A paper describes a structure:
Here, we present the model of a yeast Pol I PIC in complex with CF, Rrn3, and a transcription scaffold resolved to 4.4 Å using single‐particle cryo‐electron microscopy (cryo‐EM). The model includes the DNA‐bound Pol I‐Rrn3 complex (Engel et al, 2016; Pilsl et al, 2016), downstream and upstream DNA, the Rrn7 N‐terminal Zn‐ribbon (B‐linker and B‐reader are not resolved), the Rrn7 cyclin domains, most of the Rrn11 TPR domain, and the Rrn6 β‐propeller domain. In addition, we observed several helical densities throughout the CF‐upstream DNA region, including the DNA binding helical bundle (DBHB), which we were unable to unambiguously assign to a specific CF subunit. The cryo‐EM density reveals almost the entire path for the downstream and upstream DNA, although clear density for the single‐stranded open DNA region is missing. The upstream promoter DNA is bound by CF approximately from base pair (bp) ~−40 to ~−16 immediately upstream of the region bound by Pol I. The position of CF on the promoter DNA agrees with previously published data showing that CF interacts with the “core” promoter region (mapped to bp −38 to +5; Kulkens et al, 1991; Meier & Thoma, 2005). In the Pol II PIC, the upstream DNA is bound outside of the cleft by several transcription factors (Murakami et al, 2015; He et al, 2016; Plaschka et al, 2016), whereas in the Pol I PIC, the upstream DNA is positioned closer to the wall and protrusion domains. In contrast, in the Pol I PIC, both Rrn7 cyclin domains are located farther away from Pol I and do not directly contact Pol I. Direct interactions with Pol I are precluded in the Pol I initiation complex since the corresponding position of the N‐terminal cyclin domain near the wall in Pol II is occupied by upstream DNA in our model. Despite its different position, the N‐terminal cyclin domain of Rrn7 also uses this interface. The DBHB contacts the DNA backbone opposite to the minor groove that is close to the Rrn7 cyclin domains. Together, Rrn7 and the DBHB promote bending of the DNA by ~35° around position ~−30 and likely contribute to maintaining the upstream end of the transcription bubble next to the protrusion.
Author numbering:
A (entry chain F): 55 to 154
B (entry chain A): 1 to 141, 172 to 270, 312 to 406, 417 to 445, 451 to 637
C (entry chain D): 12 to 49, 80 to 100
D (entry chain U): 9 to 35
E (entry chain O): 48 to 248, 324 to 551, 581 to 614
F (entry chain B): 803 to 917
G (entry chain G): 8 to 95, 99 to 174, 214 to 251
H (entry chain B): 1090 to 1140, 1148 to 1203
The structure:
């Protein structure tokens, strides 16, 4: 009980130390080809597990095409945790990232 | 892989270490003592390689977890070696430390100050500080003990300060910094240390000479010759070839690893030893042998003939020799010849486990050892880890087609009725999957199977249109069980015209030879149809070429 | 039965358990039963109502 | 005999590539 | 013998404290034998073995003792033992599950499975379940899953099915709480029968099966929910739970009739049973959130129900329907222009669906909507015409048989006209699922023997 | 395309051991519809169409006291062109279990065949 | 080193907080409040309402059932708090999703009210049944308790009824009252329902 | 998908305390009790667990095997998705006396 | 030389950080290249 509180404090301290604040973030404002691929795949996976969809799927049966529609209207509720070689990260939302 | 089955725990790192005899004795499911594998009638003999405590075998339930051959993961056992044996993989290392140590003061024959200099340099290298390890050589004051102990103090002071200074900043963590250049500097030192260790003839601590140890191809150590000039100093030591048993070597290294624990702490640890474990000599020795579960030692069945286990042949031979030598040494108590065959048995047991593990480093076709199993041809890592045979894949001769899209692949209906996708049933696709379920596994676009939310599978293969129609009207039914309310049914539906496939034409010399194509099921086809635009990237000519389709 | 979606990965006591008075237990029970009443959980509330009933009355 | 909650009924049928119970399930 | 055996066991136990375990095992093996084998331990010796074991159960609570115990729990047809001996078996089990409440799990499972046996052969099983549910309330968990595990399949023998429900009813009568898992089992099983009967529409089998089951369920409900039981009882609670479960399974129930009647029938036992359940349907009908298909299914249920029931107030029904129709005036107002706007008349499936149900209800209960004066309740004369001439043009988009029957009747009653509107309609002359959904009426007449007779008091046949 | 198979009953027996095996069908035990492919002698009717799983021959071994069959297995279906019964030699006496069966596999030019 | 290794094992099985006998009642308080940290899965159906997820999925099947970690029976939970995967003001938090599946996993903080009865603790229960070899009881009329024949005093004598069931008589020579006070001899968790093995002699 | 998911993907039990896939086993329960994944390495033999005052085992810590032996502890086991060859490799490495320790998060 | 590199690893008491494509494949971990060079987190509205 006492040894866990210390372990949790260290875990959350290290997390905060690695997190790059919204202002200090310096990566590409563009969503990488890889980010787009995973977002569409993961959101499709969520859609197939009866997750609340934020778009009107006009006769759409493919979850990926639904995930594609949600991306077009920037309604995908996901965040990209961009890691750097030291372990530090930049949290970028799907909404704010520029898509070609 | 099931999306309905997520995993909450993950392996973040793997730690390499040696199993201790005490550790194996506790985890062991049964002690293996019998060289026979089967009793009469056909039941596994108690204390043998096929014991049911090592897992379920011969339609019998496991005597440890109680599960059958399917669900039982198998259990590890152990063989109690009557005498300690040299571990083949670490023999070369224990040999280096045996030749490097003094047989009198039981310290390495290299001067303590020089040994401490290596321990200091290797401690600073546990953390990413190479510059500091070289700066230690600059710390300088036949030499008196009061002066040399001050040098060891000043060096230890610099090591403790340089670590703390770098630890204060983001230069090194408590777990220590480790890079390839750091690794290069460590590898250089550990090499130089062993080279300096082996070079010394007369012990620098106590001036007495130790008898040189010689070795053969097999794991066996022996004594050396000795000229008259060497004799004249081994007799003044007190004034101021013969085989050596495994126990004698272990006992020599036991004291040396205790007396020289400080340097060996950093010689054997790449990063700081946070576990604070003692570096013991018994890690290089085997007092027990772990018996892998029956699951990984099953007898190979080829048609009608059931081959004796490849592993059980040499392993039973080791047990026969072990039981024969422990009894041939027991009748000696009520006592030359008995010592001759005792020593000869001590050799054939070390060579038995050596044969149990490796060949080219045995004999001179013998049974392959565990080293041989990991390096059979290309090796277990290359043949079964870096590369693997896969499910949901097909192979066929490619035929040209200009009527399909340049991003498409013409899939024969033969493949379309076998290759299925696990499609979870939802409100948006209940209509599409109900039809597939009715259609079944032989009518495209159909479905071969249906997975319920409880985790069970219902095959649609044997069923008629009547049962399929009933199951289709039961696809979107709400889960009564609260433990699976999160889940929804899955339909293992035929590959449709909206699916992705990985087309591969070997050799895959560049990533363009493995692209993603859009499935286009073409009726009355027996070959994979491919457009002419793809010919270049795959370097595929329609001269009877073959292509792999991955789903 | 005993899956990642059913049972948690790990449970850890963040602090030592602090004892609660008869009135605090009864105040908690009343608060919990009212919030949950507002599928197999119903049988657990049925048992919880018996504890609340025992901490102030007789069965 | 399989032994599953389900009941086999005997007469197990071998399908090349798939060994199924005549009844409920297939290994 | 008598005292020789007392020695034999007393020895066996000493021998067990020494771990020899042979003597016991000899005994266990002797008790484990089948009800048929003459060589199975006889009553008198068993009387002895039992009374000795009960007297110090702690002597046996060991790994060595496991096999013996397992052999007594697995004693074939123990309920078929003798009085005095039966009593010793019971006392033993009682004693056993007390210290190591670990065997109650095994004992009760076998008990529940015996629910397929007549109304008599289970008394002992229920007596025991009642006892230990009380003293070990935590058991309700795994023993509930047993309720699942041991249900007989639809294919399995009728005697198995009919028994396993007879017992569940018996269980219900001493463990009121467990209730839900039971009701879930009955519901899950009845849907199986209804669904299958539809699809199929051996069969002679399912008939008398499903018949034996429903007639049972409904008679228990005729009893169990009762006015006395509704004010101070668990009849009211049962009714609520049942209603929710029923709607939910039926609510989403797909194209099939054979169970939804259970509610048709219990409903009409008492005025309030009709009331509250009906209000639940009203709550279903006009929630904004529900599937375009859920609202339409409910509306079919709603219309079929009002038409067919028998224990109705003329007036509790009609006024709500009139309010819904005024609900109708709003729908058209907040939507025709939604009509002359972009889209099709399908945008309004749900409107027609409800208007159908109401029209249908008027067909069967017409003669009722004329009050003493000869005037129409809800101004049906003036009301129907307004919808018929609206821009939605209901007559074109609703059913092909109700709209016709409404025409016939409405015209006859001077309530509304239509044969010219029909002429105009067929002159001017995912879409299928809708036509499918609009063809199904969950309370069109039933097809079963006893139930039918029982429903008569609650049913209006077309005749 | 013609393919020949040798069904030898000397597969386990050696050095003139007593035999439990014999071409034909054993009495009392007979699994359903096998007579459609094989004749009374246990050998197949020359001309019969066979698919993988179909019985290509029938025998009875006394060691198992059951009537077993040697199955035909190939992706390509065939017809029986020739069945030859062969004497076992070994000082004669013994009945002819042994047997050479020729399959006729029809091969029309398919998409993929080289010309 | 001889006793240093064994010392870690004693602290693993050491009773963290003992149950005290108070208010001259003679009975020991076993209901306790313990704040815990969970690592739970979040279904994609609960992606818009995550707190309802953690509750219906993992916390609801936890109540009125013994949990090995807290060392008692979870009577309920209070104040659920999802730990944001992003260290930061708003109600919108984020949870890490598995690369393979659409399910996410998160750390949670919730206070549990548990019934923690250790051995040696004096408890009261209402006599449910009373056989010749055991006495059935109910702690707070919800938790099962049993006192075996050997755990009952020697002076006590059982009397079986012939009419229709039995009754136990105490040392004084009178039948035992509805409620009975006993000491905790052992607590059985492994089974379906929590059963307390009680003693009437010390 | 190719080298794991559609090849030898196995959800395997691992002990968080010692980091191994080969020491974990399903415990054999009593008539009413449920089976729990337990580690043979970290668990102590019941009899060997000997004893400030006397301490008592919380019952949930005692598990039994098929041989009837009682054990104390070794309940800090979880599930991880791994390739099956890893299990065969770890097994082979163990024969050679080499131990693989899998550091598994969360702890 | 699988057993040779393994021996050198054990003697170093080395920790395989599982950061190389090969190591990740060995332990069934997702490769850190391309789509594995980041993490995907879901935005949840309730506190
Ligand atoms: Zn096992
Ligand atoms: Zn020396
Ligand atoms: Zn462990």
């Amino acid at each position: 009980p006492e040894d866990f509180q210390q372990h949790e404090q260290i875990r959350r301290k290290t997390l905060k130390e690695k997190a790059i604040p919204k202002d200090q973030r310096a990566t590409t404002p563009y969503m990488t080809k890889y980010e787009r691929a995973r977002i569409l795949g993961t959101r499709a996976l969520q859609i197939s597990m009866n997750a609340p969809v934020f778009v009107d799927l006009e006769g759409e049966t493919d979850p990926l095409r639904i995930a594609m529609k949600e991306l077009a209207e920037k309604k995908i509720p996901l965040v990209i945790r961009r890691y750097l070689p030291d372990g530090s990260f930049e949290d970028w939302s799907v909404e704010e990232l520029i898509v070609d | 892989m099931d999306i309905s089955k997520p995993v909450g725990s993950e392996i973040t790192s793997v730690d390499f270490g040696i199993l201790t005899a005490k550790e194996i004795r506790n985890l062991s499911a049964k002690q293996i003592t019998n060289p026979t594998v089967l009793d009469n009638l056909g039941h596994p003999v108690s204390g043998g390689l096929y014991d049911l405590a090592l897992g379920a075998f011969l339609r019998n339930l496991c005597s440890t977890c109680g599960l059958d051959e399917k669900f039982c993961p198998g259990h590890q056992g152990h063989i109690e070696l009557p005498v300690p044996c040299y571990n083949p993989l670490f023999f070369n290392q224990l040999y280096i430390y045996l030749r490097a140590s003094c047989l009198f003061c039981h310290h390495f024959r290299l001067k303590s100050v020089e040994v401490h200099r290596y321990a200091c340099k290797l401690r600073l290298l546990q953390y990413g500080l190479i510059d500091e390890s070289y700066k230690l050589d600059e710390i300088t004051l036949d030499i008196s003990s009061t002066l040399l102990n001050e040098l060891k103090s000043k060096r230890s002071e610099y090591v403790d300060m340089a670590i703390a200074k770098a630890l204060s900043d983001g230069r090194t963590t408590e777990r220590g910094s480790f890079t390839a250049t750091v690794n290069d500097e460590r590898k250089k030192l550990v090499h130089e240390f062993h080279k300096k260790l082996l070079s010394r003839g007369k012990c620098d601590n106590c001036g007495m000479f130790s008898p040189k140890f010689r070795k053969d191809g097999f794991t066996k150590i022996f004594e050396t010759a000795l000229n008259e000039k060497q004799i004249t100093n081994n007799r003044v030591k007190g004034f101021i070839s013969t085989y050596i048993l495994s126990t004698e070597v272990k006992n020599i290294l036991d004291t040396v690893f205790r007396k020289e624990q400080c340097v060996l702490q950093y010689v054997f640890h790449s990063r700081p030893n946070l576990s604070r474990k003692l570096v013991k000599a018994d890690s290089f020795f085997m007092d027990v042998l772990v018996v892998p579960p029956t699951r990984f030692r099953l007898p190979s069945k080829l048609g009608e003939e059931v081959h004796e286990n490849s592993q059980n042949q040499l392993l039973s031979k080791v047990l026969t020799t072990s039981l024969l030598i422990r009894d041939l040494n027991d009748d000696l108590s009520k006592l030359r010849v008995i010592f001759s065959r005792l020593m000869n048995a001590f050799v054939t047991i070390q060579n038995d486990v050596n044969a149990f593990i490796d060949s080219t480093k045995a004999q001179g076709v013998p049974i392959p050892g565990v080293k041989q199993a990991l390096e059979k041809k290309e090796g277990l890592f290359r043949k079964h880890m870096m590369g693997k045979r896969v499910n949901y894949a097909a192979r066929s001769v490619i035929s040209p087609d200009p009527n399909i899209e340049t991003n498409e692949i013409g899939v024969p209906p033969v493949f379309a009725v076998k290759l299925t996708y696990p499609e979870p049933v939802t409100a948006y696709n209940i209509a599409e999957l109900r039809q597939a379920v009715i259609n079944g596994p032989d009518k495209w676009p159909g479905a071969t199977q249906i997975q319920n939310e409880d985790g069970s599978l219902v095959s649609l293969i044997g069923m008629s249109v009547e049962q399929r129609k009933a199951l289709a009207n039961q696809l979107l039914t709400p889960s009564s069980n609260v433990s699976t309310h999160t889940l929804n049914k899955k339909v293992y539906r035929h590959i449709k015209n909206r699916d992705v496939v990985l087309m591969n034409r070997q050799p895959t010399l560049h990533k363009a030879s493995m692209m993603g194509h859009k499935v286009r099921v073409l009726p009355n086809e027996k070959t994979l149809r491919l457009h002419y635009a793809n010919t270049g990237a795959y370097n595929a000519d329609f001269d009877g070429d073959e292509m792999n389709m991955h789903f | 039965t005993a899956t990642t979606l059913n049972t948690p990965v790990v449970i850890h006591a963040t602090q030592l358990p602090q004892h609660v008075s008869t009135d605090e237990v009864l105040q908690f029970l009343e608060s919990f039963i009212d919030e949950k009443e507002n599928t197999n959980l119903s049988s657990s509330i049925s048992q919880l109502k018996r504890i609340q009933r025992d901490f102030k009355g007789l069965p | 005999i399989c032994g599953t909650d389900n009941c086999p009924s005997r007469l197990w049928r071998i399908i090349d590539g798939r060994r199924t119970c005549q009844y409920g399930h297939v290994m | 013998s008598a005292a020789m055996y007392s020695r034999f066991v007393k020895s066996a136990l000493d021998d067990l404290d020494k771990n020899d375990s042979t003597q016991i095992g000899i005994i266990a093996n002797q008790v484990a034998l089948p009800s048929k084998n003459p060589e199975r331990i006889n009553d008198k010796n068993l009387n002895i073995l039992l009374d000795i074991l009960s007297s110090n159960i702690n002597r046996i609570e060991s790994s060595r003792g496991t096999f013996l115990i397992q052999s007594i729990i697995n004693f074939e047809k123990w309920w078929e033992l003798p009085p005095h001996t039966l009593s010793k078996y019971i006392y033993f089990i009682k004693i056993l599950c007390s210290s190591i409440p670990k065997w109650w799990q095994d004992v009760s499972m076998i008990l529940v499975s015996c629910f397929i046996l007549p109304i008599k052969q289970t008394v002992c099983h229920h007596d025991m379940l009642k006892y230990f549910l009380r003293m070990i309330p935590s058991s309700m968990g795994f023993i509930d899953t047993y309720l699942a595990k041991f249900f007989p399949n639809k294919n399995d023998t009728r005697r198995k099915l009919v028994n396993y429900t007879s017992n569940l009813l018996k269980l219900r009568g001493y463990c009121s709480e467990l209730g839900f898992q039971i009701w879930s089992l009955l519901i899950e099983k009845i849907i199986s029968i209804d669904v299958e009967l539809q699809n199929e529409l051996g069969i002679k089998e399912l008939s008398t099966k499903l018949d034996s089951i429903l007639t049972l369920v409904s008679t228990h409900v005729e009893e169990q929910v009762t006015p006395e039981s509704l004010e101070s009882g668990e009849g009211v609670g049962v009714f609520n739970t049942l209603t929710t479960l029923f709607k939910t399974h039926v609510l989403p129930t797909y194209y099939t009739r054979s169970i939804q009647y259970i509610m048709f029938h219990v409903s009409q036992q008492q005025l309030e049973l009709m009331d509250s359940f009906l209000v639940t349907l009203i709550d279903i009908s006009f929630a904004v959130n529900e599937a375009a298909e859920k609202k339409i299914k409910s509306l079919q249920y709603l219309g079929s129900y009002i038409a067919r029931a028998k224990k109705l107030s003329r007036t509790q029904i009609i006024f709500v329907a009139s309010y819904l129709t005024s609900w109708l005036n709003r729908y058209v107002i907040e939507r025709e222009e939604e009509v002359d706007q972009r889209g099709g008349m399908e945008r309004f499936k749900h409107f027609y669906a409800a208007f159908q149900a109401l029209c249908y209800i008027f067909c069967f209960r017409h003669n009722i909507f004329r009050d003493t004066d000869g005037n129409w309740e809800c101004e049906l004369d003036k009301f129907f015409q307004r919808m018929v001439i609206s821009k939605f043009n209901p007559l074109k988009f609703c059913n092909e048989n109700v709209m016709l029957m409404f025409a016939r009747i409405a015209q006859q009653e001077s309530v509304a006209y239509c044969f010219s509107i029909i002429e105009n309609n067929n002159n001017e002359r995912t879409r299928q699922q809708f036509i499918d959904l609009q063809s199904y009426f969950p309370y069109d007449p039933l097809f079963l023997k006893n139930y039918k007779i029982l429903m008569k008091e609650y049913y209006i046949e077309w005749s | 395309m013609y393919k020949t198979e040798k069904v030898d009953l000397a597969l386990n027996r050696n050095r003139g051991d007593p035999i439990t095996q014999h071409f034909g069908f054993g009495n009392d035990e007979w699994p359903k519809e096998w007579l459609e492919k094989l004749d009374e002698d246990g050998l197949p009717y020359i001309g019969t169409y066979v698919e993988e799983g179909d019985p290509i021959c029938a025998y009875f071994d006394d060691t198992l006291n059951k009537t077993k069959i040697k199955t035909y297995h190939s992706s390509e279906p065939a017809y029986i062109e020739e069945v030859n019964l062969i004497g076992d030699e070994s000082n004669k006496f013994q009945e002819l279990q042994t047997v050479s069966i020729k399959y006729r596999i029809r091969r029309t030019p398919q998409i993929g065949d080289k010309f | 080193n001889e006793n240093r290794e064994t010392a870690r094992f004693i602290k693993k099985h050491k009773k963290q907080v003992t149950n005290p006998i108070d208010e001259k009642n003679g009975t020991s308080n076993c209901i306790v409040r313990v704040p815990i940290a969970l690592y739970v899965s979040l279904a994609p159906m609960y992606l818009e309402n995550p707190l309802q997820g953690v509750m219906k999925q993992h916390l609801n099947p936890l109540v009125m059932k013994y949990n090995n970690k807290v060392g008692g029976v979870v009577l309920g939970y209070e104040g659920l708090k999802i730990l944001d995967a992003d260290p930061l003001d708003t109600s919108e938090k984020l949870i890490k999703i598995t690369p393979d599946t659409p399910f996410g996993f998160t750390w949670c903080h919730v206070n549990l009210y548990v019934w923690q009865p250790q051995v040696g603790d004096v408890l009261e229960g209402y006599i449910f049944i009373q056989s010749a070899s055991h006495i059935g009881l109910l702690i707070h009329d919800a938790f099962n308790a049993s006192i075996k024949k050997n755990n009952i005093p020697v002076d006590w004598t059982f009397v079986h009824n012939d009419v229709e069931l039995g009754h136990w008589v105490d040392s004084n020579g009178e039948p035992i009252d509805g409620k009975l006070r006993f000491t905790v001899r052992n607590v059985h968790t492994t089974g379906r329902v929590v059963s307390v093995d009680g003693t009437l002699i010390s | 998908d190719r080298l794991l998911n559609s090849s030898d993907y196995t959800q395997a039990s691992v002990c968080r305390e010692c980091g191994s896939i080969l020491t974990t086993q399903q415990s054999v329960p009593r008539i009413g009790s449920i089976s729990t994944v337990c580690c043979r390495r970290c668990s102590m033999r019941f009899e060997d667990a000997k004893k400030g005052e006397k301490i008592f085992i919380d019952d949930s810590q005692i598990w039994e095997d098929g041989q009837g032996n009682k054990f104390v502890g070794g309940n800090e086991t979880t599930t991880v998705a791994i390739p099956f060859v890893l299990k065969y490799l770890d097994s082979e490495l163990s024969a050679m006396g080499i131990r693989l320790r899998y550091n598994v998060e969360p702890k | 030389t699988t057993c040779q590199f393994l021996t050198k690893a054990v003697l170093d008491n080395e920790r395989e950080q599982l950061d190389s494509p090969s190591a990740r494949i060995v332990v069934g971990k997702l490769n850190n290249v391309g789509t594995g060079s980041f993490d995907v987190l879901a935005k949840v509205p309730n506190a």
